[PDB]
Amino acid sequence: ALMTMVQALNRALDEEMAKDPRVVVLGEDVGKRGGVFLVTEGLLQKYGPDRVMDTPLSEAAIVGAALGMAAHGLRPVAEIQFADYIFPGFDQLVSQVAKLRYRSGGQFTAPLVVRMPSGGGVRGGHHHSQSPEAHFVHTAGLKVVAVSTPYDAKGLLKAAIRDEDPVVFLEPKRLYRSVKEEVPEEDYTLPIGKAALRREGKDLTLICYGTVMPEVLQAAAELAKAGVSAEVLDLRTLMPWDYEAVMNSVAKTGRVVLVSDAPRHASFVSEVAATIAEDLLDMLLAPPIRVTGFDTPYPYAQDKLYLPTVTRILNAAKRALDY
Amino acid sequence: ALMTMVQALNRALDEEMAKDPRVVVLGEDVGKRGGVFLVTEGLLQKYGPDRVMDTPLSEAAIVGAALGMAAHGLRPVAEIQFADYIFPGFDQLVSQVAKLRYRSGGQFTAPLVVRMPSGGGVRGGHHHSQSPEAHFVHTAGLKVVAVSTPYDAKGLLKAAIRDEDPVVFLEPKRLYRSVKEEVPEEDYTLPIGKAALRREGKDLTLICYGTVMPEVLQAAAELAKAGVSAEVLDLRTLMPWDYEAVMNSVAKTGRVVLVSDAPRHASFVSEVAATIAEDLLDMLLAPPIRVTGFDTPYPYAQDKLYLPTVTRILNAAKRALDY
Amino acid sequence: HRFETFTEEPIRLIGEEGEWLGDFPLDLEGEKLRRLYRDMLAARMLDERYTILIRTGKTSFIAPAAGHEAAQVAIAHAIRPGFDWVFPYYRDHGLALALGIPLKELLGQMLATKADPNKGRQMPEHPGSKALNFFTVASPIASHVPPAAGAAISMKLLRTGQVAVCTFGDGATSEGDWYAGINFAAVQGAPAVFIAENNFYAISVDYRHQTHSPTIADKAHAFGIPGYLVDGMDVLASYYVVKEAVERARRGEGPSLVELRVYRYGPHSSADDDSRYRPKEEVAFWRKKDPIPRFRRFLEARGLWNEEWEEDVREEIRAELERGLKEAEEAGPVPPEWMFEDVFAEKPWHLLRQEALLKEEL
Amino acid sequence: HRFETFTEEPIRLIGEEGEWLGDFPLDLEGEKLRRLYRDMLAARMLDERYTILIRTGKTSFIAPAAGHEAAQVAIAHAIRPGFDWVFPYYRDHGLALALGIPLKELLGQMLATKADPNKGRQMPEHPGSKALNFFTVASPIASHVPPAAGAAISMKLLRTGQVAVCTFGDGATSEGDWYAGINFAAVQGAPAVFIAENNFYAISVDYRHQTHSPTIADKAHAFGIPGYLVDGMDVLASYYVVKEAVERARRGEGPSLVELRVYRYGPHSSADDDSRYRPKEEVAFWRKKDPIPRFRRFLEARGLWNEEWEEDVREEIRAELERGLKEAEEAGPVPPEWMFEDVFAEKPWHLLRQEALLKEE
Ligand SMILES: Cc1ncc(C[n+]2csc(CCOP(=O)(O)OP(=O)(O)O)c2C)c(N)n1
Ligand SMILES: Cc1ncc(C[n+]2csc(CCOP(=O)(O)OP(=O)(O)O)c2C)c(N)n1
Numbered sequence A, B: 001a002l003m004t005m006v007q008a009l010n011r012a013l014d015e016e017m018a019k020d021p022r023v024v025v026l027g028e029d030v031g032k033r034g035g036v037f038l039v040t041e042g043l044l045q046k047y048g049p050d051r052v053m054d055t056p057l058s059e060a061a062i063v064g065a066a067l068g069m070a071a072h073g074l075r076p077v078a079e080i081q082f083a084d085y086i087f088p089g090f091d092q093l094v095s096q097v098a099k100l101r102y103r104s105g106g107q108f109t110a111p112l113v114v115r116m117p118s119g120g121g122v123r124g125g126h127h128h129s130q131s132p133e134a135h136f137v138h139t140a141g142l143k144v145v146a147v148s149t150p151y152d153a154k155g156l157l158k159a160a161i162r163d164e165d166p167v168v169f170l171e172p173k174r175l176y177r178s179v180k181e182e183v184p185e186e187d188y189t190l191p192i193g194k195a196a197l198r199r200e201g202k203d204l205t206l207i208c209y210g211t212v213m214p215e216v217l218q219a220a221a222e223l224a225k226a227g228v229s230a231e232v233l234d235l236r237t238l239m240p241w242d243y244e245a246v247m248n249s250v251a252k253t254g255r256v257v258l259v260s261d262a263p264r265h266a267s268f269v270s271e272v273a274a275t276i277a278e279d280l281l282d283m284l285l286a287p288p289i290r291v292t293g294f295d296t297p298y299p300y301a302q303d304k305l306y307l308p309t310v311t312r313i314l315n316a317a318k319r320a321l322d323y
Numbered sequence C: 001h002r003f004e005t006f007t008e009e010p011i012r013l014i015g016e017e018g019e020w021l022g023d024f025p026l027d028l029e030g031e032k033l034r035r036l037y038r039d040m041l042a043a044r045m046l047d048e049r050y051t052i053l054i055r056t057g058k059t060s061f062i063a064p065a066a067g068h069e070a071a072q073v074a075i076a077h078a079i080r081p082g083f084d085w086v087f088p089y090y091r092d093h094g095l096a097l098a099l100g101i102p103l104k105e106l107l108g109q110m111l112a113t114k115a116d117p118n119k120g121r122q123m124p125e126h127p128g129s130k131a132l133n134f135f136t137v138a139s140p141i142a143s144h145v146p147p148a149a150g151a152a153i154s155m156k157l158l159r160t161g162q163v164a165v166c167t168f169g170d171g172a173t174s175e176g177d178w179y180a181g182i183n184f185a186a187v188q189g190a191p192a193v194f195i196a197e198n199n200f201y202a203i204s205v206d207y208r209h210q211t212h213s214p215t216i217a218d219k220a221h222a223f224g225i226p227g228y229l230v231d232g233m234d235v236l237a238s239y240y241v242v243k244e245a246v247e248r249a250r251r252g253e254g255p256s257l258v259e260l261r262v263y264r265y266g267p268h269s270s271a272d273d274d275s276r277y278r279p280k281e282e283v284a285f286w287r288k289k290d291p292i293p294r295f296r297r298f299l300e301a302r303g304l305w306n307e308e309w310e311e312d313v314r315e316e317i318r319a320e321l322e323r324g325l326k327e328a329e330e331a332g333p334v335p336p337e338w339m340f341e342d343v344f345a346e347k348p349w350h351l352l353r354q355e356a357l358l359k360e361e362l
Numbered sequence D: 001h002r003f004e005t006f007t008e009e010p011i012r013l014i015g016e017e018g019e020w021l022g023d024f025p026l027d028l029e030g031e032k033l034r035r036l037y038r039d040m041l042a043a044r045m046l047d048e049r050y051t052i053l054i055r056t057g058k059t060s061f062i063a064p065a066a067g068h069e070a071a072q073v074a075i076a077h078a079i080r081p082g083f084d085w086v087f088p089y090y091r092d093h094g095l096a097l098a099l100g101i102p103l104k105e106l107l108g109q110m111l112a113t114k115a116d117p118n119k120g121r122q123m124p125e126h127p128g129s130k131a132l133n134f135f136t137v138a139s140p141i142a143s144h145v146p147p148a149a150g151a152a153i154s155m156k157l158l159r160t161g162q163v164a165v166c167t168f169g170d171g172a173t174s175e176g177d178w179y180a181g182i183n184f185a186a187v188q189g190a191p192a193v194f195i196a197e198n199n200f201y202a203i204s205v206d207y208r209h210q211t212h213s214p215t216i217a218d219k220a221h222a223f224g225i226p227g228y229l230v231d232g233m234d235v236l237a238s239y240y241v242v243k244e245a246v247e248r249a250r251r252g253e254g255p256s257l258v259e260l261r262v263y264r265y266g267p268h269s270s271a272d273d274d275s276r277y278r279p280k281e282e283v284a285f286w287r288k289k290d291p292i293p294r295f296r297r298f299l300e301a302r303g304l305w306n307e308e309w310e311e312d313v314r315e316e317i318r319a320e321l322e323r324g325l326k327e328a329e330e331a332g333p334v335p336p337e338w339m340f341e342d343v344f345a346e347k348p349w350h351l352l353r354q355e356a357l358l359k360e361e
């Protein structure tokens, strides 16, 4: 069946909740309203107030209580209304959730999922979220996933809900309804930690994920018009990321451009770039080039410019090709 | 005069406070106690409770109030007892402090300093060993400084206090009294954003800062006895970092090793490394190698195995030289 | 005079027939009373104007403040604009208007034109003014509470005699920083006044699911400061209770927590759907409590209001609105370069390189 | 039947001369009363044994709990160990001991040996036990309050009939997460009991500079839940009030905030100087309120105590301490490889690589 990302995410939750009574959804406006993006629409009506619960306006309480629920007996899927707003409950996430298994020598676990909309790139009247994944990746103990297709949304969210390790699930708001795709209604999951090959190429490797997907794909198309075959690789899982997939692609093409809308400095793509340089120096025909969000707060007026454009991506590709 | 890092820092605070009435110190146990590390010893008795104030146990209140004070007319130097405890006040730091000038079109400013002990090698476990600089460097709007000598301690803290931009000042606690270096009693400052050359060399570049300087400098010394001339560069300022100093050195030597005790993934040295590979691929004779802390919470038992050892650094140096 | 704290019934001063209920004599001059009314009309009219800006696609987001007029106008008048500080949130454009912020700047911020002194950096409903000590609105809920406390402590140490008023909604009272900030202010006896514009909803989450304390005023007990429960639809009660707290703060007696019970007539925002979690009965019931008509009857009963005067005021207001919108628009779009300005006092090396990289595209 | 909330004077049940002050008649058998005393003595002696571990270098850090005994032992006995959950903080080793956590495991964590079920991953005073639902201590003040609220909500939804107790110091009540966590628990009517071990100090910062509310119990008004002011040096008053709060929570009536007023006789920690910011008049004054001698008098007045029993109890305790320490030490040092274990259920590629790299060292 064809469906948008919102629909896929919703179906994933519905499916998992039907399979396990321990799966519960909690967060701001997730019940009666069905979420500000309707990701949890109809769930309260079907599963009740004990399975889907609106919480007070406190991210610390949301992340923290979820950790407590997970340690005790439930499989909570917490929602942070926007990736930007994870900060009020940052300590709960990094000091309690991330380190529970480690500090307790394995006596206590955190089978919980924290989903959240992120990025800008769309003016639907909603808050533009500066992608904070780097903060999570830098914190040992958290698995981080960022989806970009309805098919992946369902497969991976279900995977996260079954995964015993804490998973931070990022959903690019601009992609919630940007395009429909065939999404099997049958039960299926995707593997966390594995990248997805969107397009095969041999001249250039385009490493990306989430928010920037649209521009990256069109850039590959433009490149094709010029006789350049670009391999588009959607990492999907930022931690642990698909080391093999990355290195095999760069080894092949010899030149790579990494794209993301997250701030440049100490960003996740910076990590991948630095790792490519440390391990495949001998396979590089050009310097690993990073196309990222600028090192400024997310600008509302210049949203069109902050989010990497097809042009910005192509200029980097050219630089990598002409090198 | 010869003094420890603690003495130099205390001297700096005292100097600036005598110089400007608007300079105030606030934090947990900074007053009567003189600080858990004595950095603020005697200031209360000299300047009064209205300039050196003990605060309730809330990092959000500390950082946020410091922000409010700075915006209104004071020049606060806030203290976070341990860098590990910045998280409860994270939103205040990244949402209020870092973006004030920007979101207000320059109408409001944040002339404040946030001091905090950091780094491992002191059997601090998970929350008395962290080096969270990456979280700060990744946040646009914050200047990040990490010192490693008593001389730099005084010069850069005084600089920070005079800087109208928010400055997160990290103090490697293992170095609080590691040595008594010469520190001028006269008034002087140091430039924020400029690395400090510790050793001039031409066979290898060692980029580092803060916590790991002891092992790095010792690694250099042992490389000398072995006939290798390594150049040691202490960045001092992580944001904005000395781009020129770094590129020049690497340009010369052709091979670099970056050392830090901060977790590897999406760390600060990962940023510099990725940037070196992006702008000087043509000057690299070997892959940029990173000797960092492991991607795990800071372990108590294996404390000494976590912190980079001279051996670990030498091994990295060897790979760079034998490449 | 001193109002009762933690009262079971919210404090009221305006009877249903325009009768004065105070246990102290009304001391507002006739002119000042009419001004309060004028500003509430202006606030209401600005709000309805915002509705049109959305419909016409001039702005992408609004947070309807209809119903908050009495509370917002009262606060604006309880302090000394230009002198005292205000730490507001996104729904306070009524307060911003009454405080004296130029429409050109408010609408400029809404349209993100060069007219916005905040340089179109944030989305709509994020005004900010240095001239009027209106601390630029931040997105994360209650994140402005701790800063308000710091500003107040600064005012105390520097003996400026200023006071800092901090407004927020009911939902914000659930955030940890809300509690942490006020606690510090109370301990320092800082001249700060925390005011809740309680509309019983945090988007769709109702008060009952927000907190278990019967009122927000009761929370004051956690700080050992006075707490007040006021009828936020009564502009006089709101004005006087807040004014008294401001004076208490100004004279060094520490902070207060004032709860102004109001109602959000419109949806949470232009991105929300009120008729999706609220019974038409509840809304209609509070509609009868509109603060504007209520205060009108009070002035009417004293020969301080008449149809003719109203029309005169409304006409002068709608003209000001059209003039303000015009100036805001003719200001022009904010330049793309400004994207790298104000991150720091001066643009560092990496921003210079980044700003140059953008030009390869512009 | 039911204690008064927000009382002016802290609730006390033991008179100055060992008399019972309760309205209701005492309903604890003599055996149980002696148990309470036994446990307090064991707690106090464990603390003093910790002092020795510092002096001999066996452990690198300790948080003196002397003075907290009545409160900690009372809490341990107001709940059902192994059934209800406990969310403690670093200074609760006395509570951990009375709750039944093996000395082997406590001392093992203090010494970071294989005897520590927490595998020596954290610094001393960070105990944790799966078997006894003792949620492993975390360092950030009050960070365990939201989780406690969550577990409680879980108990409610799963209708396990369990209760979750959460202990913390006075300083912790100033953190935002403290307020946020409790607020949520209160809204959900969760079976959680929040207990403050108020010793009037957060290291060197005194209560006066910590919060402006006259008591911590008053803070309960912010959540619409009942708040209790109790003499934390009175083991009976502490047991009964916490017991009542626990029963209230267990029957689905929601959380409560219980303030147990105590005093920290030792310095904040082994890395502090207590006699550097506290008036000797204050310390002396409170040293005469020691919970142990106070309950001793109560037992003596009822024929439940005598000098000879005191000696035997102390000697039994001392022997147990030695046995426990010996077992913890003989467990051996934790393997170096354990540093990469438990970050996740299984080690990802980058940890395997990092571990491998280290092994080559
Ligand atoms: C930290 C944080 N979490 C979530 C949001 C999303 N959000 C925006 S407005 C809002 C409702 C706040 O309600 P209340 O404080 O009662 O104010 P009102 O809008 O009702 O006047 C929420 C949850 C946010 N801005 N910040
Ligand atoms: C978030 C955070 N900030 C600071 C610290 C450092 N610190 C450790 S113990 C302590 C005192 C806490 O006092 P209180 O809660 O009263 O407990 P007590 O030690 O008195 O029993 C402080 C400030 C910390 N652990 N966590």
Ligand SMILES: CC(C)CCC(=O)O
Pocket (backbone or CB within 6 Å): A082, A126, A127, C090, C123, C124, C125, C138, C139, C140
């Ligand atoms: C504009 C903001 C203050 C409120 C909506 C949001 O947070 O997305």
Ligand SMILES: [Mg+2]
Pocket (backbone or CB within 6 Å): C169, C170, C171, C197, C198, C199, C200, C201, C202, C203
């Ligand atoms: Mg509201």
Ligand SMILES: [Mg+2]
Pocket (backbone or CB within 6 Å): D169, D170, D171, D197, D198, D199, D200, D201, D202, D203
């Ligand atoms: Mg205490």
